[PDB]
Amino acid sequence: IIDGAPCARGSHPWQVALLSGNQLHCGGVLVNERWVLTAAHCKMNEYTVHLGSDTLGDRRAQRIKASKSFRHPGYSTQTHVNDLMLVKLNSQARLSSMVKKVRLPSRCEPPGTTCTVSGWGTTTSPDVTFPSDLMCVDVKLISPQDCTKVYKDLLENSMLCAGIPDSKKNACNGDSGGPLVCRGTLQGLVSWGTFPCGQPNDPGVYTQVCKFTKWINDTMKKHR
Ligand SMILES: *C[C@@](*)(O)[C@H](Cc1ccccc1)NC(=O)[C@@H]1CCCN1C(=O)[C@H](C)NC(=O)[C@H](C)NC(=O)CCC(=O)O
Numbered sequence: 001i002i003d004g005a006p007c008a009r010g011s012h013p014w015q016v017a018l019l020s021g022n023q024l025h026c027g028g029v030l031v032n033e034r035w036v037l038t039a040a041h042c043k044m045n046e047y048t049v050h051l052g053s054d055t056l057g058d059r060r061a062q063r064i065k066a067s068k069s070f071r072h073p074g075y076s077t078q079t080h081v082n083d084l085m086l087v088k089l090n091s092q093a094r095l096s097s098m099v100k101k102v103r104l105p106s107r108c109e110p111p112g113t114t115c116t117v118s119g120w121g122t123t124t125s126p127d128v129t130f131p132s133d134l135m136c137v138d139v140k141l142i143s144p145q146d147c148t149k150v151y152k153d154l155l156e157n158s159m160l161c162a163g164i165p166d167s168k169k170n171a172c173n174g175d176s177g178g179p180l181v182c183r184g185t186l187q188g189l190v191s192w193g194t195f196p197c198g199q200p201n202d203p204g205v206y207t208q209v210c211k212f213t214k215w216i217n218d219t220m221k222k223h224r
Pocket residue numbers: 025026039041042080154171172173174175176177190191192193194195197204205
């Protein structure tokens with residue numbers, strides 16, 4: 001997260017992290033006791049999912065193994081359209097005051113809405129710096145028309161932009177799959193942006209969750 005601040009402790013119990021052993025790879029959100037929703041480009045052959053703490057490496061944190069991942073059938077490794085994926089938890093996820101289900105959206109929030117994006121991604125760019133504490137930053141949803149003026153052909157269907165005008169406030173490497181929340185509901189998953197991160201007027205791009213609600217449910221309904 002660029003130009004953000006440490007999230008208030010316990011304000012993100014549905015936030016999870018995908019680790020390659022001990023190193024952060026991506027972020028994600030807990031859908032239920034066995035499902036994590038993250039970015040499709042965050043795919044791994046095996047994951048070590050962090051849950052229950054704002055600090056990576058917390059001794060109290062939960063670390064569950066994952067070997068099954070289900071990317072949206074329409075994901076493109078060339079355009080990154082449909083950048084979302086569900087990862088099945090090998091073991092049950094023990095809920096608590098620090099681990100809760102995320103609230104999926106029932107509709108698409110409109111442009112101009114102020115939202116919060118969070119992650120343990122790099123806080124600097126081009127040079128990389130990874131924080132142990134979960135970082136948060138507020139951004140505003142940008143209309144598809146406005147964003148197309150910036151990215152043109154790079155924008156495909158269900159790609160939601162968010163950012164602050166003339167501001168470095170944005171997501172970056174390691175933040176993918178992480179939640180973009182507005183009004184208590186999940187509106188987006190960090191997908192992509194420009195490099196280096198935090199270029200003013202260069203919006204962060206998110207997978208627009210309100211467009212995949214049916215897919216998310218059916219996929220969890222079919223695989224256990
Ligand atoms: C996977 C996730 O952690 C990461 C998060 C992120 C978000 C914003 C900025 C940087 C990183 N997302 C990515 O790494 C995604 C998926 C791989 C490609 N990617 C990018 O964000 C890259 C840096 N962006 C691009 O390639 C975009 C589409 N174009 C440009 O940067 C312009 C280059 C050109 O014109 O060819």
